Ligand binder design. Structure first.
Ligand SMILES: OC[C@H]1O[C@@H]2O[C@H]3[C@H](O)[C@@H](O)[C@@H](O[C@H]4[C@H](O)[C@@H](O)[C@@H](O[C@H]5[C@H](O)[C@@H](O)[C@@H](O[C@H]6[C@H](O)[C@@H](O)[C@@H](O[C@H]7[C@H](O)[C@@H](O)[C@@H](O[C@H]1[C@H](O)[C@H]2O)O[C@@H]7CO)O[C@@H]6CO)O[C@@H]5CO)O[C@@H]4CO)O[C@@H]3CO
Ligand code: CA
Ligand code: CA
Ligand code: CA
Ligand code: CA
Ligand code: CA
Length: 1055
């Protein structure tokens, strides 16, 4: 346009340095951006430095501590600003400086100038900017150049940007093929669109609430968005004379959704077998070109096809022959990536990949419906356990397992199947037989730690060494071991497992050598929890016997079939849609962010950096096409892999709407699929309504409850040191069997009991009980570290547990917390008493694999990368993996002292204790399914039938007495055999007597009577008058036998 003012840099050269520091000197330039615009011949007399030596930075020579002293004025100055020559006592380390005008700080940040980072000790700064630049040119380019990314192109016509506020010139510059930069004439002569102030519309403010306060700008309706989005876009603002005020990069996810999502959601993606051949489709609305590259089995390029761009959706597609089934392929992208500001060229695997080559290097065309990829009978495989009604869901009893934890140690599993999906088919193995036994006794679901394609195990077996293989192999694959204090074992002739056993003998908090060797092992072994997504909709390859191609698909299904058909359990998958393993245009495992840069990752609103609050590269399920990827992914696991439910990792990083949307999609496929998740720390409520415990009330989406968990275990996940011992739980004798360090009061102990009773009744917001003080409280009125304790509408919305893959095992918590006088048999009963609160409760029951075997990780808190050694589960029942070396020092080193003090209080569990615990455990699961009363499903029904005795300020501490009504006041008789049930958990060292049921015909459950001396209720006495005497550390289930019709039962009181 003729009459538009040209935007340009200031009409002054890029500055050089004023002075360079000499020996025992540092130099600070203050680049006077304001006066570089000239006009006024400036005056730096009042500029001064505040300089002081502390213990972090002490290289100043004669610093002036007096803050009111303003006599450290500039050594000199030129048209670019003043500078200071600062004497030093050395040339190493750093100095502390505050840059002032009088006593006013020009930079609101204690500046740290480190000589390691700036070797010439000559740096530059600008007012209002905490960054330290190595040159005035650098600082100058920062103030008059592209920086940050706080502009947000959020729909077709709306750009949100702070930098544009009340500026005369606001424009969106764009360059197809290069970086927007000032030309040789200092001008920005790239094409642009003009922006005029406007008002944040109502649709945008709902979509982006965290941006609703941004100053809004309008683009004219004529704009050709497709052309701008194919390259770099930079928001630019300038004064009336045209001099640049600021320039920043533009986040485009919002406008991409506004432009393309409606059309793009109507399409299907990936390599899709059709009637006529194969249709390939990938979503890449900013890519300049996409080529489909076809590879031979040997990974030679055998064809390369420019794809067809759909202008309405921004998807690219290509249609080829059906002989491409089984072919390997990648997408060759030409695409601008804002992180590098380069038009990148790279090949990327398919985000909708359903088959992979070894280590996920190539995607592969697959038809998951092929009978060649199914075990025989697959299509008729049925759910062994119903999930239809709320009473169906409440029977869910989950065993959370890991592929290697199941079989890596089991010598009765054929060696080639250890650590593999197919180990579940070894019908005669100890592990499978043990699982069958647990299933027969009432474990109903296996929950699998990540079995989608994880990034953090190398699927090339030549690159991996495991502890069961020779130490020499570990040295071959891990070059760090040569330089390690274990180098002498390379020639030892023994395995790594043998060496680790040998290091046990003199392992201590002073010589943590077991952990030392294991940390090296962990870098190149086959072990990881796998919360590190590479491809969301392909099985992990390292768990297959053959990771090359489609083989893993059939082995995975053969496992799923064996679990459902031979073991009798439903299957839940852990899924991790809240982050990707990596982002950016360079990293091997960046898939999504290479194809559509800055759309699938959640970004910082100012810098454009990929956030890392999840751990890693946070994803954006609030963006429509990632929501679709998630839903499409779950559809494949649901239909093609026959998964019965899904557990979302860090689910509160997801919008409630997206989770509910996803759930409605899957329910249309299979109505009985169960969704649940875990979340505690989402700071994302400013961007959308998060999918949290509170916000999910009533929705039927389940959440892990940390309430009963913390109350029974004691303490919380962030405890360390002595707090691990002091913070006893209900299961470890809080307020009834104190250890030597604790100060738990009786009131504190009773508060834990309130949380536990509340959890056993399903942790409902509206459930009514008598609290620690004898006061009537709603579940939501019980405090939980500030939050409302009860939060659910129905007990199916709550998953109770006392042990999980993350944080310490239950046994290691009891070992930390148990009094010295609690002997080994008592600690085994503490374990069972702890699990009884879960198994006999109204919430869905969840437990870590191996709790029935007193599982220990040698006090490891976070064992995601601690290998076969610390995660071992011995299905030969020799020991519980306790006391096998100090845990990893990087995460548990500040616990070494309390560990050494508590560790050897009693003997390590052996075969006798393991069998007893398993009996206890199967007793509990059998009781859970012995009556519909345990699993009412419905919150209103729980509220009508479940009550508690032994409550209030004078309760007998540690005695939990729950009643479940099946008499006339409750409604119908849900159980033909009983008019009521009493659950009594005596988590205490004293025997206790109940008179609450005196004269009432109460009797002990037949299951526990049949267990005899082996029962958790061994020694329970029911007297003639109906008084019940409970042994120490006991669990008793009692019942009122039903007569010819529904009796009076155990009516809830109207409190
Ligand atoms: O002085 C010991 C001090 O050492 C270190 O502080 C550094 C600090 O990192 C630098 O920023 C700078 O401090 C400057 C301030 O930057 C400057 O603004 C001004 O501070 C004023 C404050 O804004 C104002 O609130 C008030 O300060 C009070 C304060 O409210 C009181 O609580 C008390 O301060 C004490 C601190 O609480 C205490 O932590 C310690 O401070 C350390 C600090 O840990 C460390 O980072 O001691 C002080 C008291 O000795 O009293 C002050 C008022 O006396 O008023 C001041 C205006 O004077 O000035 C300070 C420096 O004077 O440099 C210091 C090192 O000198
Ligand atoms: Ca320099
Ligand atoms: Ca993998
Ligand atoms: Ca590892
Ligand atoms: Ca944030
Ligand atoms: Ca009944």
């Amino acid at each position: 346009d003729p009459q538009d003012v040209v935007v340009r840099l200031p009409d002054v050269a890029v500055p050089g340095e004023a002075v360079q520091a000499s020996a025992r000197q540092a130099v600070i330039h203050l680049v006077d951006i304001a006066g570089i615009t000239s006009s006024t011949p400036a005056d730096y007399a009042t500029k001064n430095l505040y300089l002081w030596n502390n213990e972090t930075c002490d290289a100043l020579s004669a610093p002036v501590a007096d803050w009111n002293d303003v006599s450290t004025t500039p050594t000199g100055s030129d048209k670019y600003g003043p500078y200071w020559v600062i004497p030093l006592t050395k040339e190493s380390g750093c100095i502390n400086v505050i840059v002032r005008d009088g006593t006013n700080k020009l930079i609101d940040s204690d500046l740290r100038v480190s000589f390691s980072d700036f070797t010439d000790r000559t740096v530059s700064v600008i007012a209002g900017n905490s960054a330290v630049y190595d040159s005035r040119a650098d600082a100058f380019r920062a103030a008059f150049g592209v920086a940050l990314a706080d502009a947000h192109w959020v729909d077709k016509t709306t750009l949100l940007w702070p930098g544009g506020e009340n500026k005369p010139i606001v424009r969106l510059y764009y360059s197809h093929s290069s970086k927007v930069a000032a030309d040789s004439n200092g001008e920005f002569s790239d094409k642009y669109v003009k922006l005029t102030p406007t008002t944040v519309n109502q649709q945008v403010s709902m979509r982006f609430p965290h941006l609703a306060s941004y100053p809004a700008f309008k683009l004219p309706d004529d704009v050709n968005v497709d052309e701008l989005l194919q390259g770099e876009t930079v928001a630019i603002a300038a004064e009336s004379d045209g001099i640049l005020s600021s320039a920043t990069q533009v986040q485009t996810a919002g406008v991409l959704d506004d432009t393309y999502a409606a059309a793009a959601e109507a399409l299907s993606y990936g390599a899709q077998l059709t009637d006529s051949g194969v249709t390939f489709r990938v979503w890449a609305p900013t890519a300049q070109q996409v080529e489909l590259v076809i590879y031979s089995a040997d990974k030679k390029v055998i064809a390369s096809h420019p794809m067809t761009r759909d202008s309405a959706s921004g998807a690219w597609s290509w249609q080829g022959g059906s002989d491409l089934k089984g072919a390997f392929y990648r997408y060759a992208m030409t695409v601008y990536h804002p992180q590098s500001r380069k038009v990148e060229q790279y090949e990327v695997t398919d985000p909708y990949a359903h088959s992979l080559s070894t280590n996920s290097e190539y995607s592969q065309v697959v038809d998951l419906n092929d009978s060649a990829l199914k075990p025989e009978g697959w299509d008729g495989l049925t759910m062994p356990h119903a999930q239809k009604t709320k009473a169906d869901l409440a029977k869910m009893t989950i065993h959370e397992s890991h592929i290697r934890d199941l079989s890596a140690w089991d010598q009765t599993v054929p060696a080639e199947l250890r650590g593999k999906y197919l180990a579940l088919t070894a019908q005669e193995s100890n592990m499978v037989q043990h699982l069958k036994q647990l299933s027969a006794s009432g474990v109903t679901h296996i929950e699998l730690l990540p079995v989608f394609d994880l990034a953090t195990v190398n699927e090339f077996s030549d690159k991996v060494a495991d502890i069961q293989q020779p130490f020499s192999r570990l040295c071959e694959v891990n070059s760090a071991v040569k330089s390690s204090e274990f180098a002498g074992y390379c020639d030892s002739g023994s395995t790594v497992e043998e060496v680790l056993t040998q290091l046990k003998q003199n392992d201590s908090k002073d010589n943590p050598q077991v952990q030392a060797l294991n940390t090296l092992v962990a870098q190149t072994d086959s072990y990881n929890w796998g919360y590190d997504p590479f491809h969301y909709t392909v099985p992990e390859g390292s768990y297959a016997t053959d990771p090359e191609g489609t083989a893993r698909i059939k082995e995975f299904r053969t496992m799923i079939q064996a679990i459902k058909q031979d073991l009798g359990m439903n299957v839940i998958m852990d899924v991790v849609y809240n982050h990707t393993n990596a982002a950016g245009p360079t990293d091997r495992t960046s898939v999504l962010d290479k194809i559509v840069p800055w759309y699938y990752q959640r970004l910082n609103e100012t810098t454009g950096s990929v956030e890392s609050a999840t751990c890693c590269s946070d994803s954006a399920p609030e963006h429509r096409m990632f929501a679709k990827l998630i839903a499409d992914s779950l559809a494949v696991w649901t239909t093609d892999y026959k998964i019965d439910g899904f557990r979302f990792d860090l689910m509160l990083y997801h919008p409630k709407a997206q989770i509910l949307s996803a759930w409605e999609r899957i329910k249309a496929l299979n109505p009985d699929i169960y969704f649940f998740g875990e979340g505690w720390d989402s700071n994302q409520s400013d961007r959308f309504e998060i999918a949290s415990q509170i916000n999910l009330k009533g929705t039927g989406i389940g959440t892990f409850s940390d309430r009963l968990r913390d109350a029974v275990r004691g303490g919380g996940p962030f405890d360390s040191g002595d707090a691990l011992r002091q913070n006893q739980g209900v299961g470890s004798g809080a307020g009834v069997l104190p250890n030597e360090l604790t100060t738990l009061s009786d009131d504190q102990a009773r508060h834990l009991a309130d949380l536990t009773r509340l959890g056993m009744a399903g942790n409902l917001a509206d459930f009514v009980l008598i609290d620690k003080d004898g006061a009537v409280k709603r579940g939501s009125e019980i405090d939980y570290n500030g939050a409302p304790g009860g939060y659910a509408a129905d007990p199916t919305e709550v998953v109770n547990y006392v042990s999980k893959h993350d944080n310490q095992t239950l046994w290691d918590m009891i070992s930390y917390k148990a009094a010295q006088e609690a002997d080994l048999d008592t600690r085994v009963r503490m374990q069972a008493v702890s699990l009884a609160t879960v198994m006999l409760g109204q919430g869905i029951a969840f437990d870590q694999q191996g709790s029935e075997l007193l599982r220990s990780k040698s006090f490891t808190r976070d064992s995601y990368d601690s290998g076969d050694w610390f995660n071992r589960v011995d299905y030969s029942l020799q020991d519980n993996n306790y006391n096998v070396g100090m845990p990893r020092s990087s995460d548990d080193g500040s616990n070494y002292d309390i560990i050494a003090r508590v560790k050897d209080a009693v003997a390590t569990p052996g075969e006798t204790e393991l069998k007893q615990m398993t009996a206890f455990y199967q007793e509990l699961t059998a009781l859970r399914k012995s009556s519909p009363l345990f699993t009412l499903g419905d919150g209103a029904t729980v509220m009508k039938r479940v009550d508690f005795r032994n409550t209030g300020a004078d309760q007998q501490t540690g005695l939990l007495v729950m009643t479940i009504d099946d008499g006339m006041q409750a409604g119908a008789s849900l159980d033909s055999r009983v008019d009521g049930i009493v659950v009594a958990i005596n988590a205490a060292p004293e025997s206790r007597t109940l008179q609450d049921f005196a004269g009432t015909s109460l009797q002990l459950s037949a299951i526990q009577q049949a267990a005899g001396d082996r029962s958790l209720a061994s020694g329970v006495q029911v007297a003639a008058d109906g008084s019940v005497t409970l042994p120490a550390w006991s669990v008793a289930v009692l019942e009122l036998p039903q007569g010819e019709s529904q009796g009076a039962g155990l009516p809830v009181s109207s409190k």
